[PDB]
């Protein structure tokens, strides 16, 4: 068993640490609100719902009322479940969103396993609207890149998100009236505001508005789903993550189970030898996962990875064309964050409107931004890992495809390199789809080593930074430790 750390003093990444309860999200208000939740005596659940509101109210580019998303949970004792809340399409310039599966996948998991009224757990976001809060350089950045093709082209998002002709800065205050309001309603009355009240006729009648094409009825018949989760074993580590429609969960494990049959801690981080077995190994799984855009579930076999993880060669790639002749449009916006409360309950959600802001069409005057999902597939894959039969891991990624490859690495960088969360989270990152057919990098890698794999015949291709990893891991005695992302400005782990 390879040795694992958590992190020591001398480390050049420390993580963040707590005793208690801990949150990572892309969003520093979120985490806080996150925290106070637990800090109330909420559980996992109670306060991932919450930092799942808050987001809706602070990272409108990802977090949402109008979106959906996946989550999975694990309760101290080992119960592990998972909740698809993925938008449904519905029974059929114009317009392309979704039912809208966030609220209704709140709910489920709150009444199913939170301990807190809906009410309680909506309420730092419902001030955070009302009150309003500091517009910060994340949030802005995105407003300025983004926002500018297709929110001002809308006089209702315009009136939230614009200011005086320009989108706002940092240090403007966004309030947002509207969204208080709708989410002081679905505080009183429940998720069937959103499903069957006043928010429900506000979308309808935005989307008969306009193009549209989701009617009361679609809104009336939209239910999350609870799923079985995708399991396996990795070194006597357990690894949970999300099923179809995750795109993800099946390929995390077909490219974990590829990857037992080498000795990966042998040949650190970073080698020529490890980065070839991995993109390999990916390129194999993205292969595979080609066909589902034979049952799906089938290569999650142990015995079919060694079939081809016997194929690889150390010394050579294989050419992709070579494998499989030769996927649809995914956007890399989305979000992430994780939870583990005292008690040992942890979650993971990752969630989002299909790209930044979605459609840049907020719904009526409810002041809820709609998706743009054109039930979907995703490499969405919040992914819990478990050692010596307790959560040990909690970590998870927007990016699409890459999401695969970036969970990945995170796992094999704890489990396989002995790094601790921050190492794992700050480390260089690199991946292969099958298609295109190259070793995509990020900065930070030996070009000593990347000439070593253009030897073998990987084309290197050094490209933007991956993801958004917000982790947290877990000492059999509760010690929490944590990690945000530097790739994304302004996240934050906090704990108490």
């Given at each position: ?7 020591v ?17 892309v ?14 005596g ?12 808050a987001?809706?109210?602070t ?6 009322l109008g ?5 999975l949970?694990?309760?101290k ?12 399409a ?9 039912t ?23 309420q730092?976001?419902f001030?955070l ?12 950045d995105?407003?300025?890149?983004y ?15 614009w ?6 800065k940092?240090?403007?205050t966004?309030v ?17 505001e959103?499903?069957?009240?006043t928010?429900?006729?506000?979308i309808?009648?935005?989307?008969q508005?306009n ?15 609870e799923?079985?989760?995708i399991s ?16 993800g ?12 049959n080498?000795d ?5 981080f970073?080698s ?7 993109a ?31 194929q ?14 030769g996927a ?19 979650v ?7 790209t930044?802001f ?8 409810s ?14 894959s919040?992914?819990?890992?478990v ?14 495809s ?8 995170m796992?094999?960088?704890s489990?396989?390199y002995?790094l ?10 690199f ?15 030996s070009p ?30 509760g010690?929490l430790y944590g ?14």
């Amino acid at each position: 068993a390879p040795p694992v750390s958590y992190g020591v003093e001398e480390d050049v990444f420390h993580p963040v640490r707590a005793k208690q309860g801990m949150v990572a999200s892309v969003d520093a208000t979120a985490t806080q609100v996150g925290v106070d939740i637990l800090k109330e005596g909420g559980n996992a659940v109670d306060a991932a719902v919450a930092v799942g509101y808050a987001l809706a109210v602070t990272h409108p580019q990802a977090g949402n009322l109008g979106g959906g998303g996946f989550m999975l949970i694990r309760s101290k004792n080992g119960n592990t479940t998972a909740i698809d809340f993925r938008e449904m399409a519905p029974a059929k310039s114009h317009l392309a969103s979704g039912t809208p599966g966030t609220v209704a996948g709140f709910s489920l998991a709150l009444d199913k396993y939170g301990t807190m009224p809906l009410n309680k757990v909506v309420q730092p976001a419902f001030k955070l609207a009302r009150d309003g809060f500091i517009v910060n350089d994340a949030l802005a950045d995105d407003l300025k890149t983004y926002g500018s093709e297709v929110l001002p082209n809308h006089e209702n998002s315009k009136a939230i998100f614009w200011k005086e002709g320009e989108p706002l800065k940092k240090g403007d205050t966004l309030v947002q009236a509207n969204l208080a309001k709708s989410l002081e309603m679905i505080a009183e009355n429940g998720p069937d505001e959103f499903y069957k009240g006043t928010i429900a006729e506000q979308i309808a009648q935005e989307m008969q508005k306009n193009g549209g094409l989701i009617t009361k009825e679609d809104l009336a018949a939209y239910k999350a789903v609870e799923r079985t989760p995708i399991s396996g074993d990795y070194r006597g580590y357990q690894v949970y993550s999300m099923p179809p429609p995750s795109s993800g969960g099946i390929h995390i494990v077909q490219i974990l189970n590829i990857l037992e049959n080498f000795d990966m801690k042998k040949y650190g981080f970073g080698s020529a030898d490890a980065m070839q077995i991995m993109a390999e190994a990916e390129k194999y799984a993205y292969a595979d996962r080609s066909e589902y855009l034979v049952p799906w579930q089938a290569l999650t076999n142990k015995a079919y990875a060694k079939s081809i993880a016997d194929q690889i060669d150390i010394n050579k790639a294989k050419p992709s064309s070579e494998i499989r002749p030769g996927a649809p449009y995914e956007s890399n916006q989305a979000t992430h964050y994780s939870v583990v409360d005292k008690d040992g309950n942890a979650v993971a959600v990752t969630y989002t409107l299909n790209t930044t802001f979605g459609t840049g069409i907020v719904a009526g005057e409810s002041g809820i931004l709609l998706n743009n999902q054109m039930r979907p597939l995703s490499s969405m894959s919040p992914t819990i890992v478990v050692k010596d039969g307790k959560t040990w891991l909690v970590t998870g990624s927007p990016g699409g495809s890459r999401i695969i490859t970036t969970v990945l690495q995170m796992v094999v960088n704890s489990i396989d390199y002995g790094l601790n969360v921050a190492e794992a989270t700050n480390a260089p990152r690199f991946h292969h789809q099958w298609l295109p057919d190259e070793l995509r990098v990020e900065k930070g890698f030996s070009p000593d080593t990347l000439k070593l794999l253009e030897a073998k015949g990987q084309k290197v291709a050094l490209k933007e930074a991956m993801g958004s990893t917000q982790s947290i891991m877990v000492g059999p005695d509760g010690e929490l430790y944590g990690a945000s992302d530097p790739r994304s400005v302004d996240d934050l782990t906090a704990g108490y």
